[PDB]
Amino acid sequence: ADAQRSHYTVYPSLPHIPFVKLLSGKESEVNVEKRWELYHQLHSHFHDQVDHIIDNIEADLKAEISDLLYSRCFNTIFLLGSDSTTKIELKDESSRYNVLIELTPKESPNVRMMLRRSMYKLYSAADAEENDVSYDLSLVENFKRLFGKDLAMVFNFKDVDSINFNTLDNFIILLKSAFKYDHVKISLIFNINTNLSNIEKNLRQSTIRLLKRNYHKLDVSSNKGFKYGNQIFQSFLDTVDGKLNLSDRFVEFILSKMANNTNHNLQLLTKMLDYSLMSYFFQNAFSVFIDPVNVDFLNDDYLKILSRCPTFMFFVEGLIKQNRGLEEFFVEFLVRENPINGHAKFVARFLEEELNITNFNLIELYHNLLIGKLDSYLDRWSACKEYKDRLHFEPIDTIFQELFTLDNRSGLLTQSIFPSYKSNIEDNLLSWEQVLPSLSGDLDKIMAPVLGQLFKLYREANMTINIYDFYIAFRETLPKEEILNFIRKDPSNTKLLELAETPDAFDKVALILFMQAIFAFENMGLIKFQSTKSYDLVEKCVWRGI
């Protein structure tokens, strides 16, 4: 059986886009096709820019590392906030050989393995450029005799906050012995993810005094100075400029989620931007009108949906206070620029170039421009006081702009990318009628699913539960006569009828249904058995809403 194997491969027998028909299934398939094609143009125009930005990130990181690296002690570099995913390349300079030795905490169980791996890497690189050796530090001693060149080792310690600091301290003290060989120079790179002070107290004071003789700090987080996330957000602004607009709720959600992630919030930002674009091009039937070629394909369904617009609602209510024409109005009034993105780019390049204000985030600037508080964002620097009237902007609440918007009100972004996983499990357990429809019809209405009843009795019990008392409490809610009527409603199965004929049938059925749910609860992680060979009491591990 395939259900009992560890793994198996299936080559299933077979006998064109994932977009479905909107407009209650009265949309045409050609509009589905151009929805797909418009989504792909927007996605490609975003991700080409994102790829260029990422390549620029690694390029300037390599340049800054090499500048700090080449311009009787170690040359120590602390890369603060580093995920250790940077490819360090050394120069090719004659009469000296430069080796990069990368060491991970998995590759560092003790000092002996650290030295053996480093010396194998040293000998492998030096043999690969231009007789066996012992993989210890004497190869560093005899390097000029065996290869005719001076030696520059750069040690890149990947993920320093995971390494054993006693082993690392002993390895650095061991590497100190190479200082007397006159042809060797050693650089150390520590990829720190917490703080320098944490790795200060985990090392010996003499090791700190050794490292202090020549050291530099280089801070490269994912949003060091916000400069790289601003580029990604601006490329997303340019790919939807004049085409889609951002609500303040969506930008607020973006800022809230980037505040909750430290090292990898650039990819998280790209992830929610692409998921919002996916949700729009999967949801909105009006996205074909993103392209101004498709405006002649209007229908009565389109005009019926677009009439329920609150901005158009207020516009026609103001008109009455003060179809063909509606069609011409809808054609004419979607042309304009919506200049919030151009003004945001102008304010960004004015603050970055002229005033030399560089520690700003474009996302909160765009949020304040969306809510009309750009002065209330700008007055935190006390340098653009003379230009507050210069950079003043107020948004124009254009009509049917919510038919082309990226907005977070349904919680689809919350449910898909950052769900309340444990709370959703507990809510589905406690309130199962929001899961199972309300359509053996007598039993399905009078008795709950066993997992939900077990969770209802679980929630209102103590920290320690006696499972016999728990099983009696579960048994008192079940109906006896309806269960016995349901178990006898299968006349083909005679063992069921024979067990239903016994006077202790309901206790056995209740115990079977109780034990299946108890093992389900144990597998899910809700309950914990106390002892291995007692199995008489349980502890609750899980409380709802915490």
């Binding site: 996605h43 791996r117 016999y468």
Partner: protein, 251 residues
């Protein structure tokens, strides 16, 4: 419980009170009825195949209308992680075999092969899983320089696969259906590192399921970035007949 709160940290602190020794009951299973294995199995399958089968079938017909959205999420590089109350075994097989592999195979013109891991099995082993992955995908063998010094050959091979498949066209070649990504042998760190690094590759589709309430504790920022999950609650109150036989039930 003789308590004032049930939910939140208030309920956590209020329900963990020091119960006295005299208040504790002494009831055991000795006053419980004795059942055999066969009547347990008989009542089990009868209740699984007749209690609320019609609402479960209606709800399963409701969740099948989300299959094009799942396919659309898989074409953009997201990995599907399905969670909920009840078994998701039949759902994952039916979506990944009856729907996803023929749609992907027709969309890029045999069907796409589907490798199914059973993480509810304690004997699910990452080396044999990578052996079948190597058999299906035929990657280039590591050179002597790439083997490092007693390095893990599986992880180094997958890193070679990652910087090989970055240049290939974005065509899905393998579907990886992981049942119970939180099961006893798959939840270990080496297996999770292996599967997140396989989730990096655009040309592999990842469909996974979890059962534990604490399953997002398995993934840090590196693993959540590499996995790139879209989460979907598909709670159905399915009985989990297949996964229950890998534990000793009657004890």
């Amino acid at each position: 419980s003789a308590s004032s709160f049930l939910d939140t940290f208030e309920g956590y602190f209020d329900q963990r009170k020091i119960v006295r020794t005299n208040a504790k009951s002494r009831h055991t299973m000795s006053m419980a009825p004795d059942v055999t294995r066969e009547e347990f199995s008989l009542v089990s399958n009868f209740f699984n195949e007749n209690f609320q089968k019609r609402p479960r079938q209606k709800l399963f017909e409701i969740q099948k209308k989300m299959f094009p959205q799942y396919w659309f999420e898989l074409t953009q590089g997201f990995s599907l992680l399905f969670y909920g109350v009840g078994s998701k075994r039949n759902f994952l097989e039916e979506f990944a075999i009856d729907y996803l592999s023929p749609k992907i195979a027709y969309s890029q013109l045999n069907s796409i092969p589907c490798l199914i891991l059973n993480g509810y099995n304690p004997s699910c082993n990452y080396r044999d899983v990578f052996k079948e992955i190597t058999d299906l995908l035929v990657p280039a063998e590591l050179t002597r320089s790439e083997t490092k010094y007693w390095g893990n050959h599986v992880i180094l091979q997958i890193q070679k696969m990652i910087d090989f498949y970055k240049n290939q066209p974005l065509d899905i070649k393998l579907i990886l259906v992981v049942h119970n990504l939180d099961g006893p042998s798959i939840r270990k760190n080496t297996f999770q590192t292996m599967l997140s690094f396989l989730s990096v590759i655009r040309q592999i589709a990842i469909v996974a399921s979890t059962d534990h309430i604490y399953a997002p504790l398995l993934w840090d920022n590196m693993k959540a970035q590499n996995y790139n999950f879209v989460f979907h609650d598909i709670s159905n109150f399915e009985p989990s007949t297949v996964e229950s036989t890998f534990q000793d039930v009657m004890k």
